[model samples]
Target: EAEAEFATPALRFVAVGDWGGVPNAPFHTAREMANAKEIARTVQILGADFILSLGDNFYFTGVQDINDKRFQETFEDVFSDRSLRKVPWYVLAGNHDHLGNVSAQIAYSKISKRWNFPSPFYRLHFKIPQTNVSVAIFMLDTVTLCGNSDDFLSQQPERPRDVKLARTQLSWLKKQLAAAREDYVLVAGHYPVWSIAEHGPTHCLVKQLRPLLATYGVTAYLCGHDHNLQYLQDENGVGYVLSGAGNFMDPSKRHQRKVPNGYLRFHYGTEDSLGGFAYVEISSKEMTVTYIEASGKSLFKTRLPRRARP
Candidate 1:
């Protein structure tokens, strides 16, 4: 049954990132309220099998540890909707997560079934439910890779150590790319290779990761940092989808669009309240992506054919 499910593989999943709010705390804005009910309810109606947390799972700073009560306050209680509770949450640590104990999130996975975060950099293999065709997804810790350690949040050690870690990840990525025997390859990270946000494109990541993506024929790269929904494709035939506006938008940081808006793009709502998520449907022939707002508006849509490495 499951094999037929993925083969014809109408695997439906939701991508919602940068969502963190205190369950019992007062609402910061109307959009925060919207995020609590609209997004999750809509996802339930769509019958999402899982949720891809692009990053910034918590806000202000980050959780102190795996045992940190933030998990119950920000995640468990906030997203108590029946549909959300059962699905697996494949996660990545965003820049904000680095503000605290990044590894603690990984440790939290040990205690939760829905939390699928295993490591900062790891891969998941999935087979077409009915066939031998497999898909490989390489998840990365781009926050660690970027070398940004704002003194205001927290610190691990020196900048040299961060550099060393990036190098190690790159090596591991190369091996993973070369070793992928699946029919399709996908990459997920917290930072965008190219963006129109105030933070600008992650120059370091583009320089380092883009080549690997092209070389491996990665079908798509998914992320969330800009707090918006967008879809862009580069010259290399790789698809880029930004599904960050889970809870709200950074009012002061919204910037002009840079890359071509392939099909879906959201540019609405108050700075703090405007939000949305990306709905992805994977099939044997193609993957369809739709950006849906909290109000149930479908801002953009795109279809991408699967691409594989030679």
Candidate 2:
């Protein structure tokens, strides 16, 4: 029947981060707004089921509270496209978000139907329309795993690490990874496990989470923090995607040599456009990731096959 034939639609979504705008009148940087317009247009064109927000949702400091006007000005207003508003947004927190009240962001979940920050960390499970292929996405709070970053004040000492919370989350992640039976499992956070950009690799994630990903057969780790787009795959076959240039662009590859040459599949950060995001499509066979800039041009694309099961 035609209904059965059209039942199994591919799962589609977008991942973006570091997209929070300014705190002043216009509320958004020109680049942020530009990327937002492109993202909406992309969703309209390709049809997204949902969106994954990798954080830094509010710049400098996060919202003061749930009712903070920044929520309306910087976010709700800027990303007001009908296509974007129709779907849910799964969100996590970045270091800058931790600078303020993260609880407020979680609480905002109730206020906005489309905003879905349920907690500091959580998991989402989905199935491709009517196919046997399944997906499990684990959203992490790296700021909790690693101490808050202070890029502005060199004299400021690092915040005390929450060892207990970190340990608990790691244990929880291990359980989730071990139990997930999905064909594709993705771990998303605000920090990169491996990168050749400004922030480079997150030492804590590299030391702690990398082993778990390799052992548990994680398909890929999605993150954003380096203010650029990157695709890296380790010898272990785990892929790493960085989609951090949602609001600003930075082309610094100071740590290029740190990552193995073969691991770096693609990198994009130039002055050609304002910003960009990643569009992901998951079907019965493979998952495709496309990096699209503000001009609505796809710069890079990669297709990853479904993970083999035991």
Candidate 3:
């Protein structure tokens, strides 16, 4: 029976962020196109059921409105691969997106069949086909939780604070996490809780959200904003995957010494590589995450065991 049950199909999906292309003619950067091509190829090979767009779906200042041409020029045109357009893209807003109209991004969900952004923050539950394995994803709005990043070069937080909104979202997250009984629980946001890249760790998230994840047995925390691919596992057993090199690349590792020694298992953000994304496959037994670059090469792979529940 164990062998028969193991024959069940696993859950497969792609996760990418900061993939918004340029606003000028041609609309997409060469790096973006390359990554898009590789992502499409990976989806075709691995058979993705859906995609999780971590954030920064749009670049610079985001879109003016729902009818903005950037939607067509940047996203639709760049990732026009049939394999990619078919899968649902569950999206969220990044700091740049917050600079414009976030509600428009949420509203576009009604127009685009594949773009799925129900709200600023929400929970998603899925069960693996033909098995008892289940997964829960808590999508967060870090811009709202903390604050929007400065549009200028400093990349510091600007004043757009909404304490009430952050509190409300935190309450909702706590309730959802507390209630989740899935074998795998993942939380996604636009900012990293721990990173060794340019932006480094999001201190607010470390103080506010980290404890909740540890308390609730979260398997992983997915984020982007560092413009790189990283996998860091804290002593609490929570995995942190940073996949933010979809559209552009940043190779700065100024905070390398900040992260605990031995916590960072894999990191790739160099001039040699164009960009990359993360592909996840989860079965009843374990969930495997692979980091694939634009060259169609799998740079790193790791496994997270299913949560042992009572």
lDDT of 2 by residue, 214-291 (tens): 899988999998899999999987889899988888998988987877999999988567989999999888889999
- Global local distance difference test of model 1: 0.74
* Clash totals, every prediction: 5, 0, 0
Worst ten-residue run, lDDT, model 3?
Answer: 151-160
The candidate with the higher TM-score, 1 or 3, is 3
lDDT of each: 0.74, 0.88, 0.88
**Which residue pairs clash in candidate 1?**
3-129, 3-130, 6-9, 7-129, 264-300
**In model 1, which regions exceed 4 Å deviation?**
1-8, 22-33, 149-161, 251-273
Show the colliding residue pairs in model 3.
none
Tens-digit per-residue lDDT, 176-292, candidate 1: 899888887889887777666645466666778888888888889988777666677777778888877776776433345544455223343346446888888877788888877
lDDT assessment of candidate 2: 0.88
TM-score of each: 0.85, 0.94, 0.95
TM-score of 1: 0.85
Using lDDT as the yardstick, the better of models 1 and 3 is: 3
